[PDB]
Amino acid sequence: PALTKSQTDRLEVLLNPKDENSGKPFRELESELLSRRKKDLQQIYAEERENYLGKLEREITRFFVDRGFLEIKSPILIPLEYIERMGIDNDTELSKQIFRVDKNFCLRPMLAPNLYNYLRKLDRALPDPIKIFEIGPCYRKESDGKEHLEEFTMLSFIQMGSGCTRENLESIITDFLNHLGIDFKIVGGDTLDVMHGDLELSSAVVGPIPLDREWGIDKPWIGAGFGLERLLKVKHDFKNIKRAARSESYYNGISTNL
Amino acid sequence: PALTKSQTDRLEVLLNPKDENSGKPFRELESELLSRRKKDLQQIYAEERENYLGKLEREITRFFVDRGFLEIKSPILIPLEYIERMGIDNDTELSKQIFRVDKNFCLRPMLAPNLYNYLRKLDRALPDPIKIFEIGPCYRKESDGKEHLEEFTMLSFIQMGSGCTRENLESIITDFLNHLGIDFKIVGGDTLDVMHGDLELSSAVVGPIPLDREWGIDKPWIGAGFGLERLLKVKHDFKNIKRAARSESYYNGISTNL
Numbered sequence: 001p002a003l004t005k006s007q008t009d010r011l012e013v014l015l016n017p018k019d020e021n022s023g024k025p026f027r028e029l030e031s032e033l034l035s036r037r038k039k040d041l042q043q044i045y046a047e048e049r050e051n052y053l054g055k056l057e058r059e060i061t062r063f064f065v066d067r068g069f070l071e072i073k074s075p076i077l078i079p080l081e082y083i084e085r086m087g088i089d090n091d092t093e094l095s096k097q098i099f100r101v102d103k104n105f106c107l108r109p110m111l112a113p114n115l116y117n118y119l120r121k122l123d124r125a126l127p128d129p130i131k132i133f134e135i136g137p138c139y140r141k142e143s144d145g146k147e148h149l150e151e152f153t154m155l156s157f158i159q160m161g162s163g164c165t166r167e168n169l170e171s172i173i174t175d176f177l178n179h180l181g182i183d184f185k186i187v188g189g190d191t192l193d194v195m196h197g198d199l200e201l202s203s204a205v206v207g208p209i210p211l212d213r214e215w216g217i218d219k220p221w222i223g224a225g226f227g228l229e230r231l232l233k234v235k236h237d238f239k240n241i242k243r244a245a246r247s248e249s250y251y252n253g254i255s256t257n258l
Numbered sequence: 259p260a261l262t263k264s265q266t267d268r269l270e271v272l273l274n275p276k277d278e279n280s281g282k283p284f285r286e287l288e289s290e291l292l293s294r295r296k297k298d299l300q301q302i303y304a305e306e307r308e309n310y311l312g313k314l315e316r317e318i319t320r321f322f323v324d325r326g327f328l329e330i331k332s333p334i335l336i337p338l339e340y341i342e343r344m345g346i347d348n349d350t351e352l353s354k355q356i357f358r359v360d361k362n363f364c365l366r367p368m369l370a371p372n373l374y375n376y377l378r379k380l381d382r383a384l385p386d387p388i389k390i391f392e393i394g395p396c397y398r399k400e401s402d403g404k405e406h407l408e409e410f411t412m413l414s415f416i417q418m419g420s421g422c423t424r425e426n427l428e429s430i431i432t433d434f435l436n437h438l439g440i441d442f443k444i445v446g447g448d449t450l451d452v453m454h455g456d457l458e459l460s461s462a463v464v465g466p467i468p469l470d471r472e473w474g475i476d477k478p479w480i481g482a483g484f485g486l487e488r489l490l491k492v493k494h495d496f497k498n499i500k501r502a503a504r505s506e507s508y509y510n511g512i513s514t515n516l
């Protein structure tokens with residue numbers, strides 16, 4: 001007879017985007033998909049052995065290092081006061097999304113506060129313009145599940161000082177996404193969102209903005225923040241973002257429950 | 259007159275391992291070190307632009323991928339039950355070191371529980387022996403500060419099935435550390451610690467151990483866990499591990515308070 005909804009969910013777990021009702025019962029559809037997915041893992045294991053998320057991070061790192069941006073690795077566990085100093089008050093959606101740790105810390109929901117601090121300190125040492133980027137874990141409590149992870153990975157890059165125009169911002173974005181092979185449109189201090197269909201890949205900002213002064217920043221700047229799992233989702237055409245996440249249930253978008 | 263202890267602390271912050279009392283007052287020692295450290299940052303910014311921690315991670319990744327180990331990226335935020343299932347009861351030192359998040363989660367203090375789960379699942383897909391590794395953030399509350407970080411980075415690798423001997427374990431360790439250029443001694447299921455002088459670089463284990471069965475593991479295995487910041491500390495001869503940490507105060511071991 002027809003597939004149950006539960007059986008269809010199970011097959012959808014094992015289904016990869018360009019695999020492709022029939023006289024075929026569940027048992028045989030499942031056995032066929034199990035066989036294909038095991039072979040996919042075997043092929044990764046025999047050849048490249050790289051995780052997509054780690055690999056994307058290395059590729060993005062190369063891109064920005066080669067374009068003059070300094071690679072930052074800053075804390076993931078940050079002072080809780082950075083959150084209010086970011087102007088995230090009980091008025092904003094974000095205030096409710098913070099994972100708190102102990103009395104005085106939290107998991108960073110974005111890279112911005114640490115990068116603000118790096119911008120100010122590095123301005124004492126480095127010639128104009130100051131170009132930096134970080135890639136790493138960020139955390140947000142989320143109700144939604146298809147485009148949101150509670151544990152995700154952000155790329156943020158910033159240029160500060162000379163050349164901080166909207167055109168140069170859009171140009172970096174454009175070179176970046178064409179380099180990765182990802183289709184996009186830019187939709188618009190100035191605040192621009194980089195969209196893939198209805199999926200937000202990035203929020204980008206042309207500074208200065210009034211918030212800067214809280215962080216001791218008094219120069220023009222441009223920057224953007226990207227979700228790596230969203231980039232992976234689009235690039236590999238995963239229909240659920242959980243296939244692109246740090247996970248025990250998926251490896252390079254392949255189910256590990258085989 | 260003599261340097262105050264506070265002034266000496268300040269200079270020690272700006273002092274890098276092979277920089278080198280005098281008729282020289284604080285102001286001029288400080289200005290000289292400030293000048294050298296700014297130049298160090300300028301040189302990084304002009305040339306390589308890579309963060310040491312990120313770079314070490316890429317180098318370690320290459321090493322294990324090239325030796326047949328599958329690269330894993332698993333959650334950092336893990337179920338609290340993984341901790342007790344690791345046999346970390348209120349009897350062990352570790353139970354007191356867990357950063358809890360919400361009711362049911364915590365920051366992983368080690369990579370082992372997630373890798374146990376990957377070993378069991380991948381054994382259904384991959385040929386013997388199963389070789390995997392992960393590098394990423396781990397978290398422990400620590401009282402000590404000179405060799406311990408509360409936020410650090412672990413490398414863990416595991417081989418499971420055939421070839422899981424103490425000799426092959428010691429051989430991987432040995433090739434690994436000679437590749438990185440780090441001096442060590444191995445000190446000794448079997449439990450071995452990889453030492454640099456009095457500093458522990460790694461705990462390594464030859465399985466099986468009784469804990470395996472909790473995780474559905476019933477094969478021989480060998481593995482080890484390394485602190486990346488400790489490796490960096492030794493390699494760059496930093497006298498405090500905070501120079502090797504994710505930080506807003508140090509960049510590649512250079513003070514950012516200039």
Ligand SMILES: Nc1ncnc2c1ncn2[C@@H]1O[C@H](COP(=O)(O)OP(=O)(O)OP(=O)(O)O)[C@@H](O)[C@H]1O
Pocket residue numbers: 110140142147148149150152153154200201202203225226227228229230
């Ligand atoms: N929970 C999440 N899971 C996965 N990626 C995320 C998440 N939150 C943000 N991102 C990514 O980080 C980028 C910058 O963060 P930003 O604060 O602009 O997100 P956002 O505007 O809250 O996104 P959304 O409207 O989709 O919630 C986003 O464009 C998105 O790509």
Ligand SMILES: Nc1ncnc2c1ncn2[C@@H]1O[C@H](COP(=O)(O)OP(=O)(O)OP(=O)(O)O)[C@@H](O)[C@H]1O
Pocket residue numbers: 368398400405406407408410411412458459460461483484485486487488
């Ligand atoms: N708090 C920490 N900061 C930095 N590195 C750490 C920390 N805890 C563990 N490591 C690194 O992780 C490796 C494996 O973890 P393990 O649980 O064996 O540490 P440990 O035996 O508790 O170390 P120690 O005796 O130094 O506390 C250690 O050999 C060490 O290199």
Ligand SMILES: N[C@@H](Cc1cccc(I)c1)C(=O)O
Pocket residue numbers: 109110111112115156157158202203204205222223224225226
């Ligand atoms: N607003 C996003 C992306 C972003 C925008 C501007 C600057 C940066 I640095 C990052 C975020 O930080 O959540």
Ligand SMILES: N[C@@H](Cc1cccc(I)c1)C(=O)O
Pocket residue numbers: 367368369370373414415416460461462463480481482483484
């Ligand atoms: N005991 C250390 C290092 C280690 C030892 C054996 C196996 C693995 I995988 C890792 C730890 O996991 O904290």
Ligand SMILES: [Mg+2]
Pocket residue numbers: none
């Ligand atoms: Mg949001």
Ligand SMILES: [Mg+2]
Pocket residue numbers: 200
């Ligand atoms: Mg949005």
Ligand SMILES: [Mg+2]
Pocket residue numbers: 193200202203
């Ligand atoms: Mg946004």
Ligand SMILES: [Mg+2]
Pocket residue numbers: none
């Ligand atoms: Mg310890």
Ligand SMILES: [Mg+2]
Pocket residue numbers: 458
């Ligand atoms: Mg120990």
Ligand SMILES: [Mg+2]
Pocket residue numbers: 451458460461
């Ligand atoms: Mg140990």
